[PDB]
Amino acid sequence: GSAAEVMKKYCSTCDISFNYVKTYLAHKQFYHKNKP
Ligand SMILES: [Zn+2]
């Protein structure tokens, strides 16, 4: 699922897509990280 080199700009958990790696990062840091 991770810790290697999987996925790119799409969330399998939220079934969402991103046209920019920056967005996929912002989603993981914002959506899956609301208290870093
Ligand atoms: Zn997600």
mmCIF file of C-alpha atoms and ligand atoms in Angstrom:
data_model
loop_
_atom_site.group_PDB
_atom_site.id
_atom_site.type_symbol
_atom_site.label_atom_id
_atom_site.label_comp_id
_atom_site.label_asym_id
_atom_site.label_seq_id
_atom_site.Cartn_x
_atom_site.Cartn_y
_atom_site.Cartn_z
ATOM 1 C CA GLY A 1 0.000 0.000 0.000
ATOM 2 C CA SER A 2 2.952 2.306 0.617
ATOM 3 C CA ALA A 3 6.543 2.575 1.842
ATOM 4 C CA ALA A 4 8.070 1.727 -1.537
ATOM 5 C CA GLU A 5 6.662 3.505 -4.603
ATOM 6 C CA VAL A 6 2.911 3.167 -5.120
ATOM 7 C CA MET A 7 0.130 5.554 -6.145
ATOM 8 C CA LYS A 8 0.704 9.013 -7.614
ATOM 9 C CA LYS A 9 -2.085 11.600 -7.474
ATOM 10 C CA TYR A 10 -5.173 9.633 -6.434
ATOM 11 C CA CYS A 11 -6.621 8.550 -3.088
ATOM 12 C CA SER A 12 -7.984 5.014 -2.859
ATOM 13 C CA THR A 13 -9.481 5.760 0.557
ATOM 14 C CA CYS A 14 -11.313 8.929 -0.488
ATOM 15 C CA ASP A 15 -11.665 7.840 -4.122
ATOM 16 C CA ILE A 16 -10.339 11.247 -5.162
ATOM 17 C CA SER A 17 -7.962 12.308 -7.930
ATOM 18 C CA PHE A 18 -5.292 14.980 -8.305
ATOM 19 C CA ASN A 19 -3.794 16.479 -11.464
ATOM 20 C CA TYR A 20 -0.713 17.600 -9.528
ATOM 21 C CA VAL A 21 1.592 15.686 -7.181
ATOM 22 C CA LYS A 22 1.495 18.830 -5.045
ATOM 23 C CA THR A 23 -2.233 18.335 -4.517
ATOM 24 C CA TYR A 24 -1.814 14.685 -3.580
ATOM 25 C CA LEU A 25 0.712 15.839 -0.999
ATOM 26 C CA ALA A 26 -1.543 18.592 0.302
ATOM 27 C CA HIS A 27 -4.358 16.057 0.638
ATOM 28 C CA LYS A 28 -2.273 13.654 2.723
ATOM 29 C CA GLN A 29 -0.885 16.488 4.847
ATOM 30 C CA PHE A 30 -4.247 18.274 5.082
ATOM 31 C CA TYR A 31 -6.889 15.552 4.762
ATOM 32 C CA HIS A 32 -4.923 12.705 6.342
ATOM 33 C CA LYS A 33 -3.087 15.023 8.735
ATOM 34 C CA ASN A 34 -5.132 17.635 10.597
ATOM 35 C CA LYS A 35 -2.790 17.682 13.595
ATOM 36 C CA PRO A 36 0.903 17.259 12.627
HETATM 37 ZN ZN ZN B 1 -7.726 10.630 1.112
#
